[PDB]
Amino acid sequence: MSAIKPDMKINLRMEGNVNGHHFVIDGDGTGKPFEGKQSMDLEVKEGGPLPFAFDILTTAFNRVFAEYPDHIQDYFKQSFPKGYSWERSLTFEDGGICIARNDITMEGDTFYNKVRFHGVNFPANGPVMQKKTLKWEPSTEKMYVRDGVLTGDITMALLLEGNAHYRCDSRTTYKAKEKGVKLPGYHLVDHCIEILSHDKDYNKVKLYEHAVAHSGLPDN
Amino acid sequence: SAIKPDMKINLRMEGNVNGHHFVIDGDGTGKPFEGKQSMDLEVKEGGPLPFAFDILTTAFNRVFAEYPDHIQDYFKQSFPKGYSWERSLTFEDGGICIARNDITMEGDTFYNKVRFHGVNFPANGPVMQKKTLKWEPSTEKMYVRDGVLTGDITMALLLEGNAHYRCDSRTTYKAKEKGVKLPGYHLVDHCIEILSHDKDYNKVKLYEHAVAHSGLPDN
Amino acid sequence: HHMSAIKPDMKINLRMEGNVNGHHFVIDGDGTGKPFEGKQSMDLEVKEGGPLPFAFDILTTAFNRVFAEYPDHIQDYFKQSFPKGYSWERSLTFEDGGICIARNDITMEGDTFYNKVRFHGVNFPANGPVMQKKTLKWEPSTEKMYVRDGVLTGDITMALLLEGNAHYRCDSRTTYKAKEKGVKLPGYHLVDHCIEILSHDKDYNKVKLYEHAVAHSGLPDN
Amino acid sequence: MSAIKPDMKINLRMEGNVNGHHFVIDGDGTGKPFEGKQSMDLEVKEGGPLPFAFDILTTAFNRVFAEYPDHIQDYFKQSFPKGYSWERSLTFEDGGICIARNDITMEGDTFYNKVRFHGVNFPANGPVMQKKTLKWEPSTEKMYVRDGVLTGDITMALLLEGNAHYRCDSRTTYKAKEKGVKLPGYHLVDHCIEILSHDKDYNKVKLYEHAVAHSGLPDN
Ligand SMILES: O=S([O-])[O-]
Ligand SMILES: O=S([O-])[O-]
Numbered sequence: 001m002s003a004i005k006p007d008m009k010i011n012l013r014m015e016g017n018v019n020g021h022h023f024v025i026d027g028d029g030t031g032k033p034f035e036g037k038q039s040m041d042l043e044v045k046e047g048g049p050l051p052f053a054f055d056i057l058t059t060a061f062n063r064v065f066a067e068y069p070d071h072i073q074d075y076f077k078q079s080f081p082k083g084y085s086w087e088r089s090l091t092f093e094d095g096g097i098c099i100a101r102n103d104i105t106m107e108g109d110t111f112y113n114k115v116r117f118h119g120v121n122f123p124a125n126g127p128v129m130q131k132k133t134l135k136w137e138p139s140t141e142k143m144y145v146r147d148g149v150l151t152g153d154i155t156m157a158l159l160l161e162g163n164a165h166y167r168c169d170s171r172t173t174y175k176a177k178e179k180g181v182k183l184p185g186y187h188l189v190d191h192c193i194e195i196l197s198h199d200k201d202y203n204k205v206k207l208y209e210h211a212v213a214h215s216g217l218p219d220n
Numbered sequence: 221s222a223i224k225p226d227m228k229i230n231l232r233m234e235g236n237v238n239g240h241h242f243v244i245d246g247d248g249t250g251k252p253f254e255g256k257q258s259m260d261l262e263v264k265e266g267g268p269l270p271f272a273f274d275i276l277t278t279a280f281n282r283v284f285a286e287y288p289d290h291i292q293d294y295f296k297q298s299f300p301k302g303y304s305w306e307r308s309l310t311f312e313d314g315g316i317c318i319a320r321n322d323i324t325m326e327g328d329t330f331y332n333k334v335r336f337h338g339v340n341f342p343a344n345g346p347v348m349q350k351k352t353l354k355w356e357p358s359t360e361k362m363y364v365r366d367g368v369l370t371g372d373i374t375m376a377l378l379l380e381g382n383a384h385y386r387c388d389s390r391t392t393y394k395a396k397e398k399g400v401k402l403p404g405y406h407l408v409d410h411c412i413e414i415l416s417h418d419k420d421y422n423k424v425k426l427y428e429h430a431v432a433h434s435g436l437p438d439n
Numbered sequence: 440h441h442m443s444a445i446k447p448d449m450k451i452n453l454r455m456e457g458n459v460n461g462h463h464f465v466i467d468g469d470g471t472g473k474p475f476e477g478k479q480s481m482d483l484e485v486k487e488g489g490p491l492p493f494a495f496d497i498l499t500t501a502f503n504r505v506f507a508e509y510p511d512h513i514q515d516y517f518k519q520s521f522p523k524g525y526s527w528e529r530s531l532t533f534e535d536g537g538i539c540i541a542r543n544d545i546t547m548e549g550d551t552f553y554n555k556v557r558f559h560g561v562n563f564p565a566n567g568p569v570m571q572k573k574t575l576k577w578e579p580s581t582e583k584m585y586v587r588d589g590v591l592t593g594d595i596t597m598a599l600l601l602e603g604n605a606h607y608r609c610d611s612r613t614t615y616k617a618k619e620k621g622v623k624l625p626g627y628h629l630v631d632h633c634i635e636i637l638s639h640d641k642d643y644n645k646v647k648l649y650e651h652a653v654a655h656s657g658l659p660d661n
Numbered sequence: 662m663s664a665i666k667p668d669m670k671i672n673l674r675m676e677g678n679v680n681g682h683h684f685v686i687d688g689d690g691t692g693k694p695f696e697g698k699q700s701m702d703l704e705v706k707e708g709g710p711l712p713f714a715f716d717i718l719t720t721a722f723n724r725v726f727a728e729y730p731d732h733i734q735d736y737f738k739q740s741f742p743k744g745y746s747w748e749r750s751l752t753f754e755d756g757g758i759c760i761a762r763n764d765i766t767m768e769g770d771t772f773y774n775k776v777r778f779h780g781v782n783f784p785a786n787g788p789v790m791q792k793k794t795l796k797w798e799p800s801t802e803k804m805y806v807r808d809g810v811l812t813g814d815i816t817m818a819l820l821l822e823g824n825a826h827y828r829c830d831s832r833t834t835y836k837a838k839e840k841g842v843k844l845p846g847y848h849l850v851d852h853c854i855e856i857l858s859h860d861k862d863y864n865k866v867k868l869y870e871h872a873v874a875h876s877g878l879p880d881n
């Protein structure tokens with residue numbers, strides 16, 4: 001009966017374009033949906049080595065991996081077996097702007113992800129093209145309903161070389177495939193994403209994320 | 221050393237939104253180390269306010285935040301000298317607000333010289349029409365930007381009709397005593413609430429609670 | 440410093456592949472124009488994805504700055520970018536959250552320019568003017584051309600006229616990069632724009648587009 | 662039918678607070694409304710010398726000084742003799758944000774301007790606090806009505822040392838004092854502001870503006 005199982009697999013294919021540079025990246029990972037933890041092994045098939053910081057791709061690599069408590073409606077786990085899809089905009093503080101789409105589907109213990117990524121106006125001397133990023137700092141997403149659609153806004157920062165921070169503002173719009181899926185009320189989703197390991201050219205990447213939902217102070 | 225477990229709070233706030241001057245006085249208390257604080261507010265001039273009182277609340281001290289041991293408390297170490305902050309509020313309908321505050325301490329009480337200015341609020345907007353309900357809980361991102369500690373918040377106002385209203389805020393904190401160590405990147409959980417008020421919002425009770433943390437998985 | 444190889448009467452060969460709100464489409468373009476008068480006209484034709492569930496207007500500026508009246512006192516970065524050609528990247532930010540990215544690779548071969556165009560929009564509200572197709576007209580705008588991070592960049596403040604006398608704000612930044620080296624960067628200058636849909640069918644499967652652009656250096660010398 | 666003379670005098674006094682620095686500037690000049698030109702001598706009464714770039718203030722130092730054609734409704738000259746007021750937000754690309762107000766009342770032959778200005782969050786090493794600005798480039802104001810109010814949005818740029826540019830996005834709201842003043846349609850207003858002369862620390866500044874209203878191409 002259960003559409004969401006304790007241990008599930010993740011199959012992902014990304015096709016993208018940043019500043020004209022086409023790229024194709026494959027993923028194959030595992031995760032625990034009810035614990036909000038997933039890990040994935042990536043491998044760029046085309047366009048390696050990448051000319052930009054790999055970090056800007058990480059959040060495009062499923063909120064069905066998040067620990068939802070009882071008092072908050074879990075929109076994403078209720079979206080399967082049919083699945084869902086999202087759209088995202090990434091506005092960086094130095095002009096660089098990205099859009100991204102993902103169409104998620106399920107078969108058995110496996111999620112399938114059709115991911116698209118596009119970025120423009122990234123300056124050559126910028127920390128993205130200079131590859132001076134280190135990690136995404138831990139963040140907190142704001143979930144709320146906007147125009148009948150579950151939307152998530154995140155203020156977010158990249159750690160740069162030299163104790164500097166690089167600002168990125170994101171908006172995601174989630175839409176279930178099935179009709180009649182209960183939209184949740186306002187809530188927060190704490191995030192944490194990390195590159196566990198990589199080779200020199202970032203042709204091989206192991207990514208890990210942890211996400212938890214809550215109602216904020218003083219409920220958490 | 222300079223901050224007692226219980227403190228008194230005094231706040232004078234003059235402002236202008238859409239050409240409307242106003243003067244508000246605040247007298248309340250709070251326990252800094254526990255991260256909680258309360259305050260009674262009175263519109264001594266400009267009442268009744270033709271705009272939603274909620275936009276003023278965040279202007280009405282991060283020293284009232286529960287900081288752990290593993291995170292540098294830049295605000296509690298800014299005393300007895302005190303500190304200042306500037307702020308910019310950017311609402312989604314075009315309304316822009318700026319604010320500043322000088323925080324001092326003579327004895328056991330906190331003195332706050334706050335100013336507030338807001339422009340370009342739409343007439344039928346949820347602010348000038350008082351369609352707001354409360355500030356939804358948020359998370360401030362603390363990080364050093366150009367040698368100055370900076371807090372950025374994506375906060376949302378709950379409106380009437382189960383709708384939310386966007387506001388992006390950037391605050392720059394500056395300690396008076398030169399030498400106060402800047403903290404690393406960290407988060408500050410926030411929850412603000414109007415506990416009680418009258419019809420025309422002349423007398424208002426405000427309450428806050430702030431907890432600092434390292435985020436996942438250290439929170 | 441060399442011959443632009445751009446004759447006063449040029450042709451345009453365009454093909455756009457794009458995605459908006461998950462909806463995929465393919466559009467082809469055929470038109471003519473005069474680079475020295477800063478005027479051009481094109482016949483668009485939705486090959487795939489028709490009919491478009493969104494406003495056609497958001498696509499129109501994606502459908503070449505080589506068609507702009509540049510005075511000889513202002514450096515014409517685009518005309519001197521040929522015969523090698525150039526390419527641009529653009530971000531479109533609407534006031535309701537909708538964000539578009541677009542890029543065009545422009546080449547010249549003989550008498551005709553060629554455009555490989557891509558367009559991507561996200562986060563448009565279901566009841567916004569775009570998805571409801573309540574747009575009417577691109578108001579005349581002025582693009583601010585200047586070198587930024589060693590790259591010629593243009594910033595505009597655009598507005599769509601809606602039904603009911605309302606305006607739909609949009610902020611656009613375009614970056615321009617030449618394929619050949621040695622092309623001189625211009626100083627700050629303005630570019631006046633006026634794009635207009637002259638004719639179309641009901642479902643906008645076939646559209647007739649027109650642009651007129653004139654560069655200048657603002658008051659008082661304009 | 663508005664009692665606006667071809668040659669008018671301008672009286673002005675600004676009180677402001679940028680970066681915590683309080684200041685007072687007085688202004689006295691003349692202008693030609695139907696030719697859209699105006700000149701003004703400025704004097705720093707308090708706060709001198711200003712620790713920030715003077716250029717960020719000049720845009721605040723009256724749109725009746727704009728040449729309007731006959732096919733465009735001149736909302737500003739139709740607001741007198743009762744006068745009008747405006748509000749403005751200045752958003753810079755580096756985080757610096759300014760608000761500004763002015764109440765304009767006409768007393769016979771002289772225009773009076775009660776101006777207020779406030780600026781926050783300017784980086785210590787930005788071109789403003791370092792005073793690296795050279796001038797405002799000529800721009801174009803997009804006038805249109807939003808929620809029953811005349812509004813102008815401008816993409817303007819400050820020329821910096823080395824011929825770099827410093828972006829600023831601005832929005833102004835105009836409100837006539839008298840009820841039922843006919844709102845104009847979408848039109849453009851070309852601007853140029855130029856500091857003609859100044860003293861060492863900008864305590865005395867000669868300012869000039871030239872504004873012309875039009876309806877864009879091909880009317881240009
Ligand atoms: O970033 S780490 O905590 O996964
Ligand atoms: O803690 S308060 O929200 O009751």
Ligand SMILES: O=S([O-])[O-]
Nearest residue numbers: 659853854855871
């Ligand atoms: O308008 S002034 O810059 O000649």
Ligand SMILES: O=S([O-])[O-]
Nearest residue numbers: 633650651878879
């Ligand atoms: O160029 S005219 O047709 O707007």
